[PDB]
Design an enzyme around this catalytic site. Structure first.
Site, short mmCIF file in Angstrom:
data_model
loop_
_atom_site.label_atom_id
_atom_site.label_comp_id
_atom_site.label_asym_id
_atom_site.label_seq_id
_atom_site.Cartn_x
_atom_site.Cartn_y
_atom_site.Cartn_z
N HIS A 141 -4.04 -5.09 0.49
CA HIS A 141 -3.58 -5.58 1.78
C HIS A 141 -3.65 -7.10 1.79
CE1 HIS A 141 -3.00 -2.01 4.42
NE2 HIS A 141 -3.46 -1.47 3.32
N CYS A 182 0.84 -1.19 0.00
CA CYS A 182 0.00 0.00 0.00
C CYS A 182 0.88 1.25 0.00
CB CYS A 182 -1.04 -0.03 1.12
SG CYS A 182 -2.41 1.06 0.86
N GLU A 198 -2.59 -9.07 3.84
CA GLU A 198 -2.78 -9.50 5.22
C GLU A 198 -4.23 -9.29 5.68
OE1 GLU A 198 -2.03 -6.21 4.75
OE2 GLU A 198 -3.32 -5.41 6.34
#
Ligand SMILES: N[C@@H](Cc1c[nH]c2ccccc12)C(=O)O
Ligand SMILES: N[C@@H](Cc1c[nH]c2ccccc12)C(=O)O
Ligand SMILES: [Mg+2]
Ligand SMILES: [Mg+2]
Lengths: 673, 661
Positions: free
Chosen positions: B170, B83, B172
């Site tokens: 993202h 990001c 994650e």
């Protein structure tokens, strides 16, 4: 805190390194591989939290083949997972029959049905697993209970009844097997718990086979004059809520403590009269007390509250976590009662548990308070007339003489400020809140009586403290921490009013679960809470069993997600809360900068609102709720915060209305002076 | 050692989520460091990789970005910008960070991608959560986008030269898929990069856009009398076998090299004539020489073999791995020609590559040889464009072999082994010399891993279909253990039956499976955590003599693990031993009553770049002292029928038995 060390004894087998991989991936730390002909004396077993005994040829009835695996099981005193030759090893080392199975099975699959206990948690029954053995555990001793069996009708799992030992005949790591990493993670979890399982008080427990009305217990057993707590499952629902807890400050070992962020001082009041003053941070103090005053959980109880601290953590404690001391609360920034004597209601089984502490040495007639309160409780047990609770509606304001800090216009401006901050990429979600004040001559208990009737919830509470009373009708779980070290959080984010009809109720219930905006509000908080927990939880442990569930209460529909994790070794339960405080659902992401934006815009404290309220047991367990839908009562005025998520797609006016919808239960309680 | 990753925290509430995924993907937790550290005091040179976490604000302001900036620009390490990190790489290299058509915060997108680098092995589309108002619009030529969102935004980029990667989502996030995969790909890209940075030789190369007959090149360019090599793709199927390689010892710098387990002595003979005998463990010596004789991979080569050692590793070298010195080989336990000059056929594109080594700051007629040799080809390219037999004596006759199988079944019943790869060793007096017989053999059994070594002490005539180890310069490993055999059918309908039979049989699948696990094990001892996996399982491949059940395994060598160490840890191949390897190899010792030698060893090349390509030695005829030695065998398991497993070995010899007659 730290990560967990795992030893991996190689029995010169051609699968050990597969177990290495699977332990690495599951636990986020590689195991230390040692050969089985290594020297135990030299080997530093001290610096290891778990052992895995690898597969291997031949039998454990031999010095070669098995070697130092034997010592790991008998001596080390540690969590051990035997695999194949290890599993067999566990059996014979506790007197078991390891004989020829009906059919030898090499590099071949079996369907494995199991209890779902320990190393089989999460796994479906059956699952597929590769076998590599002619030998198989048959007649088990009394110390060993089997957990799983093959379609072949053969023992595939076992454990020790007392000691932390575990076995599998099958190979988790084999490429033909399923849920290898799960099993290895399960064993990690077991070891974490085992280690967490390792007192200046004597806990007396007393059961009474009556269940009065909780309000009758409050009124009957506790006084109006004095400091009292009532943790109130006004709503009881199998799985969601079951228990209620009540006590007062009259016991000889009870204490009452406040905190001030501004001073940075812990004021505490002993049962003596003594009033100490430390210059500590509160989470530090709390951690120490919880460590010093540890008590094991009594097995007869169906809950892990075995007395301890009951109270609230104020929003402004962020000053000593990841936030800044921007504003100074009128009320304490923390405030708890050390409960030495408590009454515990089991709504499910229809009985009570009385709990009271004596000092290990001296008496202090806490067994006296057991038998006396038991006879009081029996006299309060009468038929509670069934009285269904009505749902609420929307159609307005905050009450007649209730002054919001920010009026509507001011709020719509601050929503626009939030919207600016999101464009410039300073926050992704801002949990902006207001604070309504309103005069009331009402005392706490009559007013709480009304609130709990209006909006029955799992995490209601009445705290009557010298500085203030906290009238909470919160539905929100912040942190539920086992004594074994498991953690759960259920962030609420995604609100919707109840329907005026029963149809429109399902319509709003369904709209809330389906909308992208609300799911996004929720998801962003899930990620933020996972982050908080990942800071203090074991690698692999943090996960999300459920996402975007809709729970429904008299006042409102809520979108709830469930996050879980398991604490790292060394991480106290108080550390875990400090890590997560304030809750993501009341701040937004990213927390730090979001909380700064909050400081500028709110132009004052949240106080108890936005904080956590619940209990910290001496067992090391905790149950904390987010403080929302809560009236703070002090000095003849009722204060209650209301909030909402501000995101890219927020609509200034709709968000303002959301705050009012939420104030409904509090506003309705206060109605009628 | 294990690879060390640095995660730079940008005071964002997703950093410990990245910590989790890296921990699980790589098997090793990152060292977290705040964005306001101190670059000098920080020991960046200790780490092997950097993950730059997301954040609020812009990559512009120091507030938000800080030391991350220097990680991208200066560190010279592999970097993954997530990001804000991805937004930083765009801008730092002169790209534009502009407003996206709609701000996307905690909202999913279908990401479609090229399958490259951080996206390897991921489906397109896949789901990912976004947290950004800003996005990369104008990419420099330095940067190359790899992934795009469903609303036409850049989701992923890389730098063309430097090892930088950015993702604008993202991985994650709980709403994202394949997060752990992405973090593993980055680990792999970081491992690879460092192996590319790890000279006494100059390498010269020359392409020639003509392709002569492989066999005629051997007859024409190479001599019948010298000591040559011929790595022969007699079967050329796309993306499975493409090249062939030939050479000799008529170089200035070329060396013949032999080892004996008995002595423990490496014996090198330069082109000067004088030998040089060293007392040293082979793999150590081979590892050491490949260290000192490192040569960068030429990029204009579609193959990684940039010259090096061509030859075999005899079975008995097990004595330096996980095995015992039980039997002396008649032959050398290793035999390698150090090739300073080689011809390489590209059967796909229909051209040749010549390679030659001059010493650094010296001239030994490489370029002179390249013209000489390349010219010769062109002329030849137009002239020629693209049971066990009668006098054969097995070591064990049928009766003996049957009783050895029984011993295997007994050890299996005891649980000393799960599988035993019992083998026989046939010898037979023959009239023919090396090249004539290989000529028959390669025509009989076209395979991808055919070989003709013509060394002094022996000729080797392989018709191996099997791959043992294919190690890249980038440290990526592959292994395709064959286990599970079937004869061909008389007709086309019979072949289908047998192909299906071999696929479905529980017995065969189990045979293959145990090796898959065994090989996974060997690779895992030398490979990065998470890197080992099994793309294919129980694939069937068809060759002129048999149908073979093949399973494919892959991995990534750990930092500071030599390609030689990898071969050591896998040798001998489980394919040819069975599991558990050590105990099983001791059983093999007792029962076989003698050496395998070249048979069940490995044959192929070790490149100076650090690459290698090794076949298993099956379907192979050694020639020495006017005598043809070939080995056969097969897996013994609890389900094995004695009489059937014997017949299997006779079927396996048909190619060799045909070639001699
Ligand atoms: N609902 C909890 C007990 C409880 C009620 N109100 C609370 C407020 C805070 C903490 C816990 C509680 C249970 O059933 O176990
Ligand atoms: N087929 C291999 C080269 C090769 C042919 N025969 C061999 C024997 C051993 C090792 C390699 C080879 C390739 O495509 O590159
Ligand atoms: Mg599997
Ligand atoms: Mg909202």
């Amino acid at each position: 805190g730290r990560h967990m060390r795992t030893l991996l004894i190689d029995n010169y087998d051609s699968f050990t390194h597969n177990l290495f991989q699977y332990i690495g991936e599951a636990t986020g730390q590689p195991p230390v591989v040692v050969p089985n002909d290594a020297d135990w004396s030299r080997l530093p077993v001290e610096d290891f939290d778990a052992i895995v005994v690898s597969p291997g040829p031949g039998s454990p009835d031999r010095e070669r083949d098995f070697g130092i695996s034997r010592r790991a099981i008998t001596d080390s005193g540690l969590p051990v997972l035997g695999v194949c030759l290890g599993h067999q090893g566990i059996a014979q080392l506790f007197g078991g029959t390891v004989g020829l199975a009906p059919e030898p099975m090499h590099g071949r699959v079996s369907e494995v049905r199991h209890t779902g206990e320990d190393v089989f948690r999460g796994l479906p029954s059956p699952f597929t697993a590769v076998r590599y053995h002619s030998l198989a555990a048959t007649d088990l001793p009394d110390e060993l209970e089997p957990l799983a069996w093959s379609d072949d009708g053969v023992v595939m799992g076992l454990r020790h009844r007392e000691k932390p030992l575990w076995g599998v005949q099958f190979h988790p790591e084999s490429i033909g097997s399923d849920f290898g990493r799960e099993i290895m993670a399960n064993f990690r979890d077991l070891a974490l718990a085992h280690h967490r399982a390792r007192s200046p008080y004597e806990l007396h427990v007393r059961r009474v086979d009556v269940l009065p009305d909780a309000e009758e217990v409050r009124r009957g057993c506790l006084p109006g004059e004095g400091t009292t707590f009532w943790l109130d499952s006004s709503s009881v629902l199998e799985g969601a809520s079951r228990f209620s807890f009540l006590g007062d400050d009259r016991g000889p070992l009870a204490e009452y403590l406040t905190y001030r962020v501004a001073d940075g001082v812990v004021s505490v009041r002993g049962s003596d009269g003594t009033t100490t003053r430390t210059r500590r941070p509160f989470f530090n103090y709390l951690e120490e007390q919880l460590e010093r005053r540890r008590v094991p959980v009594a097995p007869e109880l169906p809950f892990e509250f075995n007395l301890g601290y009951v109270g609230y953590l104020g929003y402004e404690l962020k000053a000593e976590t990841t936030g800044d001391p921007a504003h100074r609360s009128p009320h304490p920034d923390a405030a708890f009662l050390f409960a030495d004597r408590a009454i515990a209601l089991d709504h499910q089984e229809g009985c009570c548990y009385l709990l009271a502490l004596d000092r290990r040495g001296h008496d202090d007639g806490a067994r006296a308070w057991l038998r006396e309160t038991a006879e009081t409780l029996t006299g309060l047990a009468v038929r509670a007339p069934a009285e269904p609770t009505p749902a609420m509606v929307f159609g307005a304001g905050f009450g007649p003489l209730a002054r919001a800090r920010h009026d509507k216009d001011a709020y719509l401006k601050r929503i626009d400020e939030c919207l600016k901050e999101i464009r410039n990429g300073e926050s992704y979600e801002i949990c902006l809140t207001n604070m309504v004040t309103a005069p009331t001559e009402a005392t706490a208990l009559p007013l709480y009586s009304a609130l709990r009737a209006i909006s029955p919830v799992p995490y209601g509470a009445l705290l009557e403290f010298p500085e203030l009373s906290v009238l909470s009708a919160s539905p929100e779980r912040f942190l539920t921490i086992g004594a074994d070290g498991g953690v759960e959080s259920k962030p609420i984010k995604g609100t919707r009013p109840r329907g005026g009809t029963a149809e429109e109720d399902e319509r709003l219930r369904a709209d809330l679960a389906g909308r992208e905006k609300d799911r996004a509000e929720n998801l962003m908080i899930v990620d933020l809470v996972r982050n908080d927990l990942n800071s203090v939880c074991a690698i692999g442990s943090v996960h999300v069993p459920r996402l975007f569930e809709v729970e429904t209460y008299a006042p409102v529909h809520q979108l709830v997600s469930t996050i879980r994790g398991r604490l790292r070794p060394g991480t106290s339960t108080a550390a875990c809360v400090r890590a997560a405080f304030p809750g993501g659902s009341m701040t937004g992401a990213p927390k730090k900068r979001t909380m700064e934006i909050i400081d500028r815009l709110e132009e004052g404290p949240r106080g108890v609102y936005s904080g956590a309220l619940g209990w910290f047991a001496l067992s090391g367990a905790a149950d904390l709720s987010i403080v929302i839908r809560t009236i703070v009562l002090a000095d003849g005025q009722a204060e209650f915060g209301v909030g909402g998520a501000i995101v890219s797609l927020s609509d200034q006016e709709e968000e303002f209305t959301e705050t009012v919808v939420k104030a409904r239960a509090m506003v309705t309680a206060l109605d009628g002076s």
